[PDB]
């Protein structure tokens, strides 16, 4: 899932993490009043979209730039009038852009030192790890390739929690000196407790900075959430902003389905993440291009099968469909019943290659054999990929 900047910074602020004081505004006049309520020497106005590159974006109203600084609340409102309701395009959005319904109006703050600080679930370390570097403001992967000696880590015991010793040591390795070190360590501690509270897989702060006035502030941040914890994170997941996700993926999610759209013309209807990846791979190997990744999982119900199959027949790029099921917990007959129900309402007009094996395979083949649909039968995964690629080429 995804949170807007104002949502993640509110979540951080409500949990003791120091961020820039800010208001969110739905209108230009609200933005102008927000600027006044702040009573700050300088103000930053930021368009609220999930994509990146907001600095170099351009609105369909002409305003070049999604982030602006001014000392005058009047300029904040003047700029906001060109943002709200107007589509903001950037290097990482579609050329159309994203309708900006909200802008953030926050106290601008001078940054006298930039550091990197994150907390993540580290598979290698079997639990949470603090990751920090005094080299702030750049891709941490670029720091790990150029200057791995400047990447500092602490392994946090999940039951003991972060120790003061660990927070202090990380504050020191990031360059924080004297009073600023105690500030930094207490923020590190609060970020770690937030990370656990919200079932994050990662909380990344960059820059984790100092201001000339001696404040430690989280200036920008990104939070990745564990989808598996949605059942105990209803409030946070309610805030999920799906407005920038690919539309078929959004549809699939409504039915607990994992769909990732690709660039090809051969649709894939597969169970299992590994078999689904391997089906995309073997289509490529045999000269085709897959249209999507789809992981039909666990105890599929007929209605989910039906809906998922329709996600494929509605993509305009699809010129053939490859169904490849190796059922263990997935019941092949439920797949067969869901597919036939979907096809009864479609004209199809696309080749349909079908490979089925595993649980209840025999009943499923009878359903398909009696359906009257033009199905191309496949004996194995290679045969299915070759037949799918041939049918469109």
């Amino acid at each position: 899932m995804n949170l807007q900047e104002y949502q993640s910074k509110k979540l951080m602020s409500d949990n003791g993490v120091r961020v820039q004081r800010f208001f969110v505004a739905d209108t230009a006049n609200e933005a102008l009043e927000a600027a006044k309520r702040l009573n700050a020497k300088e103000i930053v106005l930021k368009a609220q979209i999930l994509a990146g590159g907001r600095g170099k974006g351009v609105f369909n109203s002409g305003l070049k730039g999604g982030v602006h600084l001014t000392k005058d609340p009047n300029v904040v409102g003047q700029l906001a009038k060109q943002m709200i309701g107007y589509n903001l395009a950037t290097k990482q959005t579609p050329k159309e852009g994203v309708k900006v319904n909200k802008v953030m109006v926050a106290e601008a703050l001078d940054i006298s030192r930039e550091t990197y600080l994150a907390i993540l679930m580290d598979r290698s370390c079997n639990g949470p790890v603090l990751v920090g570097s005094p080299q702030g403001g750049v891709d941490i992967e670029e720091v790990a390739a150029s200057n791995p000696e400047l990447i500092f880590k602490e392994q946090i015991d999940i039951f003991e929690g972060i120790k003061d010793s660990q927070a202090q040591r990380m504050a020191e390795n990031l360059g924080f000196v004297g009073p600023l070190k105690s500030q930094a360590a207490d923020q590190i501690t609060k970020l770690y407790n937030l990370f656990l509270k919200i079932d994050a897989t990662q909380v990344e702060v960059n820059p984790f900075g100092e201001t000339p006035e001696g404040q430690v502030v989280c200036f920008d941040a990104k939070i990745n959430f564990d989808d598996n914890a949605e059942f105990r994170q209803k409030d946070i997941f309610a805030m999920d902003d799906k407005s920038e996700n690919e539309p078929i993926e959004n549809e699939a999610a409504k039915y607990d389905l994992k769909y990732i759209g690709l660039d090809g013309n051969i649709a894939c209807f597969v169970n299992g993440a590994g078999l689904a990846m391997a089906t995309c791979d073997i289509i490529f190997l045999n000269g085709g291009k897959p249209a999507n990744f789809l992981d039909l999982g666990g105890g599929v119900k007929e209605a989910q099968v039906y809906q998922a199959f329709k996600l494929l027949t509605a993509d305009p790029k699809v010129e053939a469909i490859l169904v490849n099921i190796f059922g263990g917990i997935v019941n092949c007959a439920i797949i067969a019943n869901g597919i036939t129900k979907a096809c009864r309402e479609l004209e199809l007009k696309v080749p349909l290659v079908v490979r089925l094996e595993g649980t209840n395979v025999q009943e499923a083949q009878k359903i398909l054999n009696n359906s009257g649909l033009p199905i191309t039968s496949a004996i194995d995964l290679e045969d299915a990929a070759k037949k799918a690629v041939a049918s469109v080429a």
Binding site: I158, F159, F231, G272, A273, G274, D281, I329, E357
Partner: protein
């Protein structure tokens, strides 16, 4: 240390099983299949139904109760995600020698706590979660894998993907080699058994004459296994190893179903794992349909087929 429990992976005809979540939809169906397959399922747990009878077998409220009364040495978990970490911990606390967790969707933070406990003992070996289970063909089936595709034989299979395990089994049955032991370690990022755990068993098991290792994008477990194989499987009596790594064509920065399966920060690509395994002498099948034929040919070259 926890590695002392690796031997508990090698279930056999004498292994007796209980099913946690016995009376639920999936626990019932796959318990039925295990019964028909001949596996010694002797009961199960469902808190609040202790004393009842299910599939002709006793239901218990607790694992300790079920273990004492039935002598079971392994448990399989069909418990929903909000409760499955607690179910795993109960089996660990009861010192069940082998626990298999099928459940998909356990919070990562939950599994972090589970591993903390697991690594600090060695009575219990965990397979999973988000896995198909383990099967010793003809002797003991613990999980969701379709029974009829297996044939007892000579290839040890370890896989991060459930469904690709079935493919590897089916192909090695077709070419006549069969399977000695099949372990699906699952697609979650924090689990109880990795590649090296299974490779230790395979390299020391005389019944295992070759190995199929199935991996995918994400993490570094395949790179670790390559190094383990470099040092422990490079002699003249080395066992052939064949592998397929899923996700060569996957887009970067996307979770491909599995939480584990993601190319992040420029790390976790498939080709890097393929090159690493190739450096260790593993033969990597580029097509996932050709694992069986690829390892058959490696047996042919080494004059290992009966003929």
């Amino acid at each position: 240390s926890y590695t002392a429990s690796r031997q508990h992976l090698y279930v056999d005809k004498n292994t007796k099983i209980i099913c946690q979540g016995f009376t639920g939809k999936q626990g019932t169906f796959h318990s039925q299949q295990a019964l028909e397959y001949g596996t010694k399922l002797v009961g199960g747990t469902t808190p609040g139904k202790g004393g009842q009878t299910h599939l002709g077998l006793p239901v218990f409220n607790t694992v300790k109760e079920a273990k004492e009364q039935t002598g079971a040495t392994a448990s399989v978990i069909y418990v929903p995600p909000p409760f499955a970490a607690a179910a795993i911990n109960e089996a660990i606390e009861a010192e069940i020698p082998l626990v298999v967790c099928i459940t998909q969707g356990i919070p990562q933070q939950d599994m972090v706590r589970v591993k903390h406990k697991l690594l600090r003992q060695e009575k219990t070996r965990l397979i999973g979660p988000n896995c198909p289970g383990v099967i010793n063909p003809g002797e003991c089936k613990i999980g969701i894998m379709p029974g009829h595709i297996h044939k007892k034989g000579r290839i040890g299979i370890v896989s991060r993907s459930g469904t690709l395990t079935y493919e590897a089994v089916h192909q090695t049955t077709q070419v006549g080699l069969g399977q000695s032991l099949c372990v699906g370690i699952g697609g979650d990022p924090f689990n109880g058994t990795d590649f090296i755990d299974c490779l230790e068993i395979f390299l020391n098991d005389s019944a295992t004459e070759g190995i199929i290792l199935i991996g995918e994008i994400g993490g570094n477990a395949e790179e670790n296994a390559a190094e383990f194989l470099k040092q422990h499987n490079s002699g003249p009596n080395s066992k052939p190893v064949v592998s397929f790594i899923a996700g060569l064509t996957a887009p970067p920065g996307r979770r491909m179903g599995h939480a584990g399966a993601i190319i992040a920060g420029g790390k976790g690509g498939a080709k890097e794992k393929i090159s690493a395994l190739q450096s260790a002498g593993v033969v990597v099948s580029m097509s996932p349909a050709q694992l069986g034929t690829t390892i058959y040919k490696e047996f042919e070259k080494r004059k290992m087929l009966e003929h």
